[PDB]
Design an enzyme around this catalytic site. Structure first.
Site, PDB file in Angstrom:
ATOM      1  N   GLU D 235       0.797  -1.238   0.000  1.00 29.50           N
ATOM      2  CA  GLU D 235       0.000   0.000   0.000  1.00 29.50           C
ATOM      3  C   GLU D 235       0.832   1.293   0.000  1.00 29.50           C
ATOM      4  OE1 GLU D 235      -3.074  -0.361   3.047  1.00 29.50           O
ATOM      5  OE2 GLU D 235      -4.162  -1.741   1.737  1.00 29.50           O
ATOM      6  N   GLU D 340      -4.554  -8.881  -0.927  1.00 29.53           N
ATOM      7  CA  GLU D 340      -4.990  -8.632   0.462  1.00 29.53           C
ATOM      8  C   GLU D 340      -6.438  -8.220   0.567  1.00 29.53           C
ATOM      9  OE1 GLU D 340      -2.242  -6.310   3.188  1.00 29.53           O
ATOM     10  OE2 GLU D 340      -4.191  -5.545   3.887  1.00 29.53           O
ATOM     11  N   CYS D 342      -9.496  -8.048   3.999  1.00 34.53           N
ATOM     12  CA  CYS D 342     -10.104  -8.389   5.285  1.00 34.53           C
ATOM     13  C   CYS D 342     -11.293  -7.496   5.538  1.00 34.53           C
ATOM     14  CB  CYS D 342      -9.107  -8.271   6.449  1.00 34.53           C
ATOM     15  SG  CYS D 342      -8.560  -6.602   6.864  1.00 34.53           S
ATOM     16  N   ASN D 370     -13.661 -10.711  -9.051  1.00 33.64           N
ATOM     17  CA  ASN D 370     -12.260 -10.692  -9.441  1.00 33.64           C
ATOM     18  C   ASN D 370     -11.984 -11.699 -10.564  1.00 33.64           C
ATOM     19  OD1 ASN D 370      -9.934  -9.099  -7.628  1.00 33.64           O
ATOM     20  ND2 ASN D 370     -11.897  -9.285  -6.624  1.00 33.64           N
TER      21      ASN D 370
END
Ligand SMILES: *C(=O)CCCCCCCCC#Cc1ccc2c(c1)C[C@@H](Nc1nc(-c3cccnc3)nc3ccccc13)C2
Ligand SMILES: *[C@@H]1O[C@H](CO)[C@@H](O)[C@H](O)[C@H]1NC(C)=O
Lengths: 497, 497, 497, 496
Positions: D235, D340, D342, D370
């Site tokens: 990030e 990633e 969550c 996706n």
């Protein structure tokens, strides 16, 4: 009259401590003689709107930074400055003992304080409330027979607004904005989330919602309060977002255009509150000029719209020139007004940073930029919050210029209070922005205005760490020799005749 | 009429879920015929006050556990059961939509619920409040000219109490208790901490405080509410402790004796509220019999004292026989009454454990023990709390039989609700405890009473994991054959004529 | 040598800021001439153990407060002062860069700091740990073949203890205490909650647990560390409490008596670590004298018990005279020792209050009271914590005299550090408390001791806001004329020959 | 072999309870006969990847919903699925007794579990750590002589990764990502806050940082672990934000372009780890296609970049078509990979909602979307967390598919575990997404792939409350008649 009692909480600067028997305050406004200037100074190091005076000199030599007033270059006229009387704000103020309450209200609204002349009033509940309520929660009440103001308005907000108006020497303008309609008027049947008004403009759902505005104004009028303006919806883009966590009501620009034209405009114009101004958008300036184009090119809508209300939250994506500037160029007779701002809402950042000079600078930098791009006023969000940045029923905790500590009958005035005060106290309604040019490139932010009486006001913000020697040239009176210290804000005032 | 909607939160048992359109409830009380019994059963496994019926048999053979009613062994008469209308409780209830509110109030107060006939009302603020306030905060107002009921009473507590009384079929008795006096009447000048009334009994400080009780009763009377009783102070021992964190007012037993004799007694007796009962102590039963001896051996005090109010918090240090039993033996005409209890306040334990069967058993075990030692009533603390066990301005979060979730317009009825209900619903005012003897040693807790009409009620609590077959012998009518499952509570009812 | 760098965080006083290149420190101890006294002063206003000097005068006149030394009235001898090397403390220290680490360790342990001579070492995990390990978690390992020290001991605690001993000029005594046994030795099969050792004293469970102590001492001895003492269990009462949230092991006084007599005593005495002292209780002084009576009236137990360890958490319920005083009267040859104290665990207070003078005063008030009632030492809890008061796996966050900010390679020395330092620095091991009498009633807390060399030390704490003029009379040398300012602590030192 | 032990914590569905002697598990994979299909079903009502079978029918009549496989319409090939071995995850796993640990690792990595083949490994500390370390904290060590792996790697992460690879039947790919550099390489001199690498690409600061990657790979190689890939920074937009609360390192897309071209690319290519893939972005898909344009139009950078890693956190602002789709259209030979995800970080929600079906559906909806927009893999964040959603040194507590209760030697498998498992267990590496068309408009989310051996896999997610009767047409074998219940997820498998 009474200086700041400083207190540090480990951030870049101090707060000023107030309680039942003490709060920092100004002497009554004096008008100093022609040939002299007043300077009010606040610094990161601890000075809080400290008054000094100096001579305006006949001559000036040197290669230093010169700011030259251009009194014949005239721009927008100022409506005013203020903040929001939310449920949370009202609750926090009323948590204090009555004498402390009065010192807080005096700080904001009196001439011994910073002279706020705008109060924004939510129409029923928002996230800064302890419960979700509208004025008409009895289901399917399209007639609004069971419309009523709950305790939040009648016992908390309205009495505080009265007390504020009693303390104010300037006329105070009230601004109303709704977050959600009754859930039975909405497609999703909930106060939050993605959802708009059921049906289409013209119909019963939209006519009931328009009538709710009038019912609100009626009820507040029965309590001896009149509104300067209303907004068509708080942040209408929010209600277009799936999972939006708190009270909202979604409108596309087209939906807002048609709602204004078919329902809200006519209903307001055909009521006893026809003089109340209607502001559109009440949302991020990133949405301009598009939103203004969509609404104001329809003359059936445009004829009801006095102005455009903007919020600051996406300013970083939206250069002022391309949004505020372009909107003004296209629609110069439609005023631009900043209706909401707060720090502390970014998901990764701390809600409340007691004594943050950075947050003060964010306020003053924003106000200056807005004033340099035709904006006629600037309105803070919650007038007061607790040390957690609440109460807030969804935990969207944020900062406020005044933080109230209920357990100590104490409140703290943050740098934000003083940075806002450097404008609000010294830029009365009807002041006009005028030209101000720099002799060379510099790191200062500055704006010049003229009061209605012809006297001058200049605000100078230094966000750098370097002291900047500078001179202000007024062609009429002469030269003001001064220094702008690192991490400072100054307001300069002087008579021109 | 409507069964429990069970929901598990990971503790030993379920809660029952209620909302705007559904809550579990009973049919109207039917009086079944002579020769039959009613059984209400709740279990850890999920049963919630389920109604079954059976025959009373003429004969019984076997070596099983026999509980034998002794209707001629007569003991105390019952005043009633209920809970406390705190600011926190009222706020939580009013966080629900009106139909959900009514279902909650019906759950507690109607015959379709558990038939509460006591409401305890704090006199101004306690820890279960969002701010510290008294009714007379204007300093040195010995006349109490500025005595008034704030929004907490007039908008939250009083309207809810009205609505509760409207829903109740039995007469409801109100009980008032103060936590603190105005701070200007106190030695320490603060709502909390170690501090008593200034000066001595007889003087202006004490007369003003006595008059505050009358002012409270007057104000509530203007709102069409009358009190059955008042307590002389909530937990007077608390105000003797240095650093006591929330609202308190300290009295030694001698100080309370003399305050009653010289001030509170005479002032109440000389007012329009002379029929209101006065209860003493309102504190831990560990303080008995000493506190009762000190007060009631002074006839000048004793003549004003109807009863002795006890709290459960130090019961583990204070065997019932040596405290409740001994106090009754010494003073048999002075009633013993349990005025406050809650779980979750021990510093090491979780405040709220949604669905805790253990906490249910603590309530029913306490009520049984109290009833077996002359106690005439039992009163829960907060009627409702949020999932954190608040609001509470000092963070003394605790559990409650009803937990309200504001964000879902939902409330949860805990095992505590039903364990309390097994007594409150079936033991009306004027019921009398009677003898009940076991044929052999056992692990059950049991109590027997007779209603005013002569009908029998027996509550059987099984805190063990083993099912216990048992028989209840009534000499008049015959034998009730039944089983007490592990982790169960049963209420048995039957006519005797 | 180097003064305090003060920093305020909004509480009553300042912290002293330290980092990689700077920490406040003392010059080497000077012994001033006979006829002169040294005064070290700390104040709420900002003074931190500041050295001044003055004359001891031959004569004294006046009616002011006189404190008279009584050198022939001899009481207990001092073991020492220190704090605890928890996992949390070690992690926080090691979060600093090595030079900052050494300045922190020097602050506590060197003669340029405050001269700590005690370190308390938990035997495996407590709440101030990031996980719940014991030294023998492999199930049913009654032989303890798989006993071993994990990374917390070998990489964090043991190396820091070595470094501390290297920096110390006084001999340092280590004290060990266990929180829980392996779960397979416990009735509840868990590290926390209500649970004791399985079975009974004498049996395999108890013999294994006793052997675990020896295994601990062996393992630490292999790392070149010897213990002065061990406690029989950390807070044995905690393991008697249902739902106790963190590592514990429950013992009644009888259970502890019998465990000492049958298992722990004999096993220690029959090992190479037979010189290690055994302390009993390690729990609240409210439990005395009862706990001491139960254990020490059994000669089979008493012969293994050197002393009684006390914790401060329920001091407010337990007057010193009736607990510490009475225990000493009964058992004068069994030393009393304060083994744990911290502030911040009360639910209504902040865990960490950076710069709290109140918390400093709580430490010094406690130490004085303890010393006045026969106590031979006083031990702080965590040597260092983070700004949240952790890490702590159950969120029992508390305060500490040193707060480490990992992100800034900075630590803060709180008033607690200095209040503790006023004793630890100036009361070496073998010092003896002597008599000190006041000529009149006063608000000061004071204690007098004599060093092994005969020199005098007096500590004076003023918790009031009023400056108190006072005189200290030493019959041998004369009169010390001084003032005790409001919110101050002074240590006085002088030669007597 | 062993069913779910259900337990409710008051949310919409159950967790499955595991401990030292019990965890739910599958029998070894059977390949059922041609003409039959396998269905694995999970439901909000409590079913957990339950196996049933049925016939593939020759004929089909009706007006019902038909999903038609298009095996000749070929799209991306799948790399795999997995999660992250953070310090927090490792600590939580090691808080269990060894037999419970092995049941947890088996749940994720074995064929008796859900067959994870990706593990993401942070390079030194992140927010899901108990302290703020890097591998080279000794100041001004531009040579990295004092580079070393602390206890978090050598005692917690590395031994667990070994154990996971031992249990796995499929080859497991490791993916590395850094959060912060040593503070002495940064403009702000701190692990968090707004701050980038000092100086400019090419210089010593940037060359040292590039060398740190190689030093990391070396150290892990000495412990017998090789990486499939690394990301250029976790990030990078985070380090551009004032007051960013935890470990970060800011890069603009230009700065990342130039860092890859001048430093990271060359240093990796000139090392023994030159086969390790380099992924760019590792950030929100809102930043695409712009970030991809900036980096990949520079051939000096583009030649080092194997793929683009995306995080899901701002998906609500960023339609897949306009971000993932457009990036693929512009750069079809640069793989898109989800690195990633969550739930629980939003301030108004609970960090951990034990038994949340909604959170399960968020995972499966995201994976499907996706996969329908060219993405070759999907990676969860922390493999395990405690009931608070930690440990986490800045209190950024979040949810995880496995929640460990240290005091009870127990772990809870959430709906997220099973929703992820419906893909990870049945979509091996090298599987290829193929066409699947609906006969009419519907509320289902569905994707079809073909295994390397030619067998078919279809996942069907029903996020509505309505049962949807449906038929799957395979032109080669015939018709699968089935129902998709409300609040269900099904995986269908069959030989072709
Ligand atoms: C404060 O001491 C001044 C007097 C305060 C007025 C009375 C307050 C009543 C309501 C309360 C409370 C309260 C009091 C004391 C403590 C706590 C809450 C938390 C507790 N901390 C604490 N306790 C123990 C402990 C274990 C076993 C038996 N007794 C006490 N152990 C601790 C260990 C480590 C850290 C904190 C501990 C003290
Ligand atoms: C325990 O000790 C034995 C030898 O006594 C050894 O073989 C075994 O591996 C050790 N460790 C464990 C986990 O059992």
């Amino acid at each position: 009259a009474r200086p700041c009692i400083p207190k540090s909480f480990g951030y870049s600067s101090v707060v000023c401590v107030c309680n039942a028997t003490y709060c920092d305050s100004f002497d009554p406004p004096t008008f100093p003689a022609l040939g002299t200037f007043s300077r009010y100074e606040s610094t990161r190091s601890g000075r809080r709107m400290e008054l000094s005076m100096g001579p305006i000199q006949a001559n000036h030599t040197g290669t230093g930074l010169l700011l030259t007033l251009q009194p014949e270059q005239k721009f927008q006229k100022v409506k005013g400055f203020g903040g929001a009387m939310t449920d949370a704000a009202a609750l926090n103020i009323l948590a204090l003992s009555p004498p402390a309450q009065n010192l807080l209200l005096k700080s904001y609204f009196s001439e011994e304080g910073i002279g706020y002349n705008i109060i924004r009033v939510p129409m029923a509940s928002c996230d800064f409330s302890i419960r979700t309520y509208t004025y008409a929660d009895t289901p399917d009440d399209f007639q609004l027979h069971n419309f009523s103001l709950p305790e939040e308005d009648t016992k908390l907000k309205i009495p505080l607004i009265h007390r504020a108006l009693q303390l104010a020497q300037r006329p105070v303008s009230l601004l109303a904005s709704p977050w959600t309609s009754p859930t039975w008027l909405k497609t999703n049947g909930a106060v939050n989330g993605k959802g708009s008004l059921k049906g289409q403009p013209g119909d019963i759902y939209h006519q009931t919602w328009a009538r709710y505005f009038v019912k609100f104004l009626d009820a507040y009028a029965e309590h001896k309060l009149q509104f300067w303006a209303v907004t068509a919806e708080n942040e209408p883009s929010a209600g277009l977002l799936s999972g939006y966590p708190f009270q909202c009501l979604g409108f596309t620009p087209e939906h807002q255009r048609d709602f204004i034209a078919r329902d809200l405009g006519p209903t307001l114009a055909n009521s006893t509150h026809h003089n109340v101004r209607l502001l559109m958008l009440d949302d991020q300036r990133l949405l301009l000029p598009h939103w203004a184009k969509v609404v104001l090119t329809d003359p059936e809508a445009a004829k009801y719209v006095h102005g455009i209300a903007v919020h600051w939250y996406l300013d970083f994506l939206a250069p002022a020139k391309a949004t505020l500037g372009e909107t003004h160029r296209l629609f110069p007779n439609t005023m631009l007004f900043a209706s909401e701002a707060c720090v502390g809402s970014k998901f990764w950042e701390q809600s409340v940073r007691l004594g943050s000079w950075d947050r003060g600078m964010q306020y003053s930098h924003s106000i200056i930029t807005n004033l340099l791009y035709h904006v006629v006023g600037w309105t803070d969000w919650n007038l007061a919050l607790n040390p957690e940045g609440g109460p807030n029923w969804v935990r969207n905790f944020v900062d406020s210029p005044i933080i109230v500590d209920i357990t100590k009958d104490t409140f703290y005035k943050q740098p934000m209070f003083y940075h806002l005060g450097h404008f609000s106290k010294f830029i009365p309604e009807g002041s006009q922005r005028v030209g101000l040019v720099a002799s060379q490139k510099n790191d200062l932010d500055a704006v010049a205005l003229m009061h209605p009486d012809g006297s001058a006001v200049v605000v100078v913000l230094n966000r750098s760490s370097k002291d900047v020697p500078l001179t202000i040239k007024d062609p009429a009176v002469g030269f003001l020799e001064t220094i702008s210290p690192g991490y400072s804000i100054h307001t300069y005032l002087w008579r021109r005749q």
